[PDB]
């Protein structure tokens, strides 16, 4: 129920399901973006995953334990988005990040545009480590999208 890998986050009422996001299971902890789940509990098969750590400003939440993803973008190299769009199998897209310049420092950012329910898809370094999650960003003048490479802290 917590096997390592990438997962879709789905919602269902009385009728069909909607993919609201994606996340990463690593070391028994599920990692996604806050705006996907609003910090609510998740079902995994017959089990319940309870929120553990989170931070709305970072737009991140972990389930079952503290945030485990520690790898950092090296500030230089190309990365891959492992996009898991609604209704499509996972696909890898390589890109050279740009930069969100903020008053508190620079954050890598990827100019890749996918449906809203792709939120939480992992961004990878060349070793396959998760350097952040896709899906919190800005819309630039022409309507296209740029996502921060959002990473939490492993305490």
């Amino acid at each position: 129920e917590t096997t390592d890998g990438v997962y879709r986050v789905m919602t269902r009422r009385l009728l069909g399901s909607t993919q609201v996001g994606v996340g990463v299971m690593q070391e028994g902890v599920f990692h996604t973006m806050w705006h996907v789940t609003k910090g609510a509990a998740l079902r995994s098969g017959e089990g319940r995953l309870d929120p553990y750590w989170g931070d709305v400003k970072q737009d991140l939440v972990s389930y079952c334990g503290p945030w485990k993803l520690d790898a950092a973008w090296d500030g230089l190299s190309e990365v891959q988005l492992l996009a898991v769009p609604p209704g499509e199998r996972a696909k890898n897209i390589q890109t050279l990040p740009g930069i969100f310049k903020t008053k508190d420092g620079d954050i890598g950012a990827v100019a890749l545009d996918y449906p809203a329910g792709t939120s939480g898809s992992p961004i990878l370094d060349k070793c396959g480590r998760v350097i952040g999650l896709y899906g919190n960003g800005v819309v630039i003048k022409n309507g296209s999208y740029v996502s921060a490479i959002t990473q939490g802290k492993r305490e």
């Binding site: 910090g39 929120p51 553990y52 750590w53 989170g54 931070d55 709305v56």
Partner: peptide, 4 residues
């Protein structure tokens, strides 16, 4: 909680 913005559990702490």
């Amino acid at each position: 909680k913005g559990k702490w």
